[PDB]
Design a binder for this molecule. Sequence first.
Ligand SMILES: [Cl-]
Ligand SMILES: [Zn+2]
Length: 436
Amino acid sequence: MTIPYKEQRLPIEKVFRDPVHNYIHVQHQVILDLINSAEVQRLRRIKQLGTSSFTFHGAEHSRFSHSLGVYEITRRICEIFQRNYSVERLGENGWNDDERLITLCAALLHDVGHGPYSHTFEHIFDTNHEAITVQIITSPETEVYQILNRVSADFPEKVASVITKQYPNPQVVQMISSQIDADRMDYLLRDAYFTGTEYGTFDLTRILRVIRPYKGGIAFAMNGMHAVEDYIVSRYQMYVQVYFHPVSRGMEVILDHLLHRAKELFENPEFDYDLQASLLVPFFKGDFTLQEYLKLDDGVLSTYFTQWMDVPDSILGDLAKRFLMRKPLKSATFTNEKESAATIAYLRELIEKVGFNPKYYTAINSSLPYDFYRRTQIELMQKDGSLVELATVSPLVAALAGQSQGDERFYFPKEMLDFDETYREFSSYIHNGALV
Ligand SMILES: [Cl-]
Ligand SMILES: [Zn+2]
């Protein structure tokens, strides 16, 4: 006729079953094609909770299922915006539905650049998922780009501009990235379910009941303050029980140390014949291609780690064992970085005498909460027209904003708390997961 690619609908609404949202609804051809693109399909083979998933049994949900979730919350929000908060009846403070497609695409593609065990992988190799996401969307060698380009020649650039917070419409940008966006709302609910963290679940329906657009972006009806508060508390709960949880952090250290060791053996003339990890080679060399990056996923790396147990290097072989047996390093807390630097260095010698290289079996670690402007880093609430920020009306949120925790952890093998005179000497400086 021809119906433009923008407006193409499915004969019948496609659906995806979901434990968090019940059903993911797909009705645009573009969205379906985006979902079926190699780039987005790759996310099925990548765990949302990287190393942290090994902390809770069964929490191996993929980044793909999270992406669909953000997409789903987003369309629920756009549907709410059109039915009762359009430009047609609110003017400048209204929502333009012509923005529906782009926000849906950005929602779904917001995490395409992640890669396996993203956070840890991101440190060892100089990669950046936010930039790769934008790269995937804007470079022609991608199925995502080819799909977007069919919407309009300038569409790939515009979708990318939403992700980088440069898109001219704030309502679109904040729906995908703010202090209370579709992205955050999804992973908090999704990670809460899979890890079984009961206190991590908040009521999404209440928040959706009060969500609203306005001139400068996205606001929430004043009366829904406590529903927003419940979201803040749930965010706090996920942070302490799941994200900054000690044993999940002990898992990141092991993976970090495993990859470090792998890279050092590779750069060394004769320390490891050939570790057979062809897909990691371009990364060890520091000369990687986009296509080479897209070939990587959790399954690919797990295969290599399993193979590294045979590698004639005690350190590498032992770390791969500890990673696959899902046993992280144990830890203890401390406040003084300089005053307790003597105690740390001392018990590091004790770890050597036993047979553990402190560079690989020890670590010092420390750590994003809600804090009003010092902007777009605040959630706003509408009274009778005007806008006020959350911490100004919520003593609870104001309390958690000023609460900053300088948590400092010291890692070591669990086997230190089990020729036995040294173990007795070591455990003497640790009482209830804290230094003495
Ligand atoms: Cl990770
Ligand atoms: Zn996300």
